[PDB]
Design an enzyme around this catalytic site. Structure first.
Site: not given
Ligand SMILES: CC(C)Cn1c(=O)n(C)c(=O)c2nc[nH]c21
Ligand SMILES: [Mg+2]
Ligand SMILES: [Zn+2]
Length: 338
Positions: A78, A82, A118-119, A230
């Site tokens: 994050h 990103h 956004h983050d 996202d």
């Molecule tokens: C960062 C998270 C909240 C969501 N998220 C994501 O964006 N990506 C790309 C994943 O591969 C992933 N695996 C679990 N959560 C994930």
């Molecule tokens: Mg977020």
């Molecule tokens: Zn994000």
């Protein structure tokens, strides 16, 4: 301040000078060196005509971009790269999909600024952890939900409200209020619990057909687009999928370790002693990522390659899972690990 001086006085580099493949779904913005990303943001805003269209002040915009950048910390996933890569995917959707047939110029501009912001100020833990840990952010926002997303949004507003950084301050009262309302809706849409709540409404929109005169359809479509930005790391090649999983799980397992240390039992996805990465990735792809890109394809036939990349990256996890089982002896010929 020296980065500012160059960003302001050097000129905005032509967006085609960044990379021959910069406007393609196959380009990986994580390839761009971090020191080149603020100028790439100005290049994209220029190519989308937003600087001219909204008569954004150059000094204010350079300050704003740098401030947003400086507003991210450095957890493994994050961080500013990103935000930068999400913002680039917004630019891709604009260049490859004819958004102007679906959304107002002001909507498209808000989606892009919301992607940058956004983050903001993410600390590498999620909404659940804010609540469990009794953080200051949960003190402020737990009663409404979407704690981190509310904090991102508030951070964005604090940047705008910083002298010299309000890129919208010449707007009319009506347009300024619209832009800030859009930013609120779009950044709150990045809470995946929100996406899950509106999923049925998205499917219904796709099935009956997008109506440009329907204000609720605009709102649903901005949510889907922001989600699609996202999660866009999943739409590149296998090398990107693999590297993003390493970063996401490093971040999740750091959280799980803090949770253990305060006497809570983590989610399996957050516990490094229990998480089985291939299975977790496949579940995220089947249950969250593929349905999102499938809806995107439904609304925009030219998006089909994105859904196909996600499905192929999903098949790739099934193909490699066997490697997670230790055949033979470890490389050191030792069973000490037991
Ligand atoms: C960062 C998270 C909240 C969501 N998220 C994501 O964006 N990506 C790309 C994943 O591969 C992933 N695996 C679990 N959560 C994930
Ligand atoms: Mg977020
Ligand atoms: Zn994000």
């Amino acid at each position: 301040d020296d980065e500012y001086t160059k960003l302001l006085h050097d000129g905005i580099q032509p967006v085609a000078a960044i990379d021959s493949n910069f406007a393609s779904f196959t380009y990986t913005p994580r390839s761009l060196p971090e020191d080149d990303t603020s100028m790439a943001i100005l290049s994209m805003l220029q190519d989308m005509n937003f600087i001219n269209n909204y008569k954004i002040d150059c000094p204010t915009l350079a300050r704003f971009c740098l401030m947003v950048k400086k507003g991210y910390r450095d957890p493994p996933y994050h961080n500013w790269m990103h935000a930068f890569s999400v913002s680039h995917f917004c630019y891709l959707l604009y260049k490859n999909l004819e958004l102007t047939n679906y959304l107002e110029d002001i909507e498209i501009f808000a989606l892009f600024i919301s992607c940058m912001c956004h983050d903001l100020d993410h600390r590498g833990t999620n909404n659940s952890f804010q609540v469990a840990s009794k953080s200051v952010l949960a003190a402020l926002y737990s009663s409404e939900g979407s704690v981190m997303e509310r904090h991102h949004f508030a951070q964005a507003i604090a940047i705008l409200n910083t002298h010299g950084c309000n890129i919208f301050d010449h707007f009319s009262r009506k347009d300024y209020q619209r832009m800030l309302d859009l930013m609120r809706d779009i950044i709150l849409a990045t809470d995946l619990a929100h996406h899950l709540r509106i999923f049925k409404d998205l499917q219904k929109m796709a099935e009956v057909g997008y109506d440009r005169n329907n204000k609720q359809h605009h709102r649903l479509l901005l949510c889907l687009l922001m989600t699609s930005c996202d999660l866009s790391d999943q739409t590149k090649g296998w090398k990107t999928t693999r590297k993003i999983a390493e970063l996401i799980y490093k971040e999740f397992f750091s959280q799980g370790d803090l949770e253990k240390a305060m006497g809570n039992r983590p989610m399996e996805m957050m516990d490094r002693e229990k998480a089985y990465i291939p299975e977790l990735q496949i579940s995220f792809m089947e249950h969250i990522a593929m349905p999102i890109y499938k809806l995107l394809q439904d609304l925009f036939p030219k998006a089909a390659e994105l859904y196909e990349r996600v499905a192929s990256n999903r098949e790739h996890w099934t193909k490699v899972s066997h490697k997670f089982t230790i055949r033979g002896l470890p490389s050191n010929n030792s069973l000490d690990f037991l």
